[PDB]
Amino acid sequence: PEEALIVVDMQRDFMPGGALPVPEGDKIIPKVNEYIRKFKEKGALIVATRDWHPENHISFRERGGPWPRHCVQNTPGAEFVVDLPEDAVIISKATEPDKEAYSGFEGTDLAKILRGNGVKRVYICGVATEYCVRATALDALKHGFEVYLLRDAVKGIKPEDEERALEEMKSRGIKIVQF
Numbered sequence: 001p002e003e004a005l006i007v008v009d010m011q012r013d014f015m016p017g018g019a020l021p022v023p024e025g026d027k028i029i030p031k032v033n034e035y036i037r038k039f040k041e042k043g044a045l046i047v048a049t050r051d052w053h054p055e056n057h058i059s060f061r062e063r064g065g066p067w068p069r070h071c072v073q074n075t076p077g078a079e080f081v082v083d084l085p086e087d088a089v090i091i092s093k094a095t096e097p098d099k100e101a102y103s104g105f106e107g108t109d110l111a112k113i114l115r116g117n118g119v120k121r122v123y124i125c126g127v128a129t130e131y132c133v134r135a136t137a138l139d140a141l142k143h144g145f146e147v148y149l150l151r152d153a154v155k156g157i158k159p160e161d162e163e164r165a166l167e168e169m170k171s172r173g174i175k176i177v178q179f
Contacts, residue, residue, distance in 0.1 A: 003120070039123070057094065124150065
């Protein structure tokens with residue numbers, strides 16, 4: 001199809017009550033699900049990215065990284081918290097012990113899959129705005145996709161960082177919309 005929805009890291013550990021929670025991250029889940037449903041009705045490709053970490057990943061504290069253990073392979077924390085269609089494409093990133101990857105494009109087949117399905121425009125939602133959502137949106141832009149940001153279906157960790165990221169994304173070519 002011509003458009004794709006990309007749902008960034010809507011996982012248990014990034015929601016309130018998780019190991020690396022996004023403040024009020026759960027409040028965007030209804031709208032995120034609503035966009036999925038909407039895009040799914042329009043026959044659009046649905047993509048869901050997930051951190052899929054091995055134990056002792058380089059980003060973890062135990063190897064001196066900034067984050068506590070989170071979103072480990074085959075654990076409750078890595079579970080999706082959104083309702084995805086059967087035909088959703090799942091993208092797992094940062095699966096190797098030393099492979100770092102904020103963007104859903106980093107070390108994945110995301111670009112080739114997108115072009116192989118004839119996608120021309122991508123819509124980004126998810127968490128966190130100033131981290132993986134921005135990185136993924138910026139990488140989508142790199143690869144020549146028309147990129148949109150779903151304003152009411154993204155959430156970040158600190159407002160000022162959030163605002164910063166949204167501004168930066170807009171100045172670079174990323175369209176911010178809602179519907």
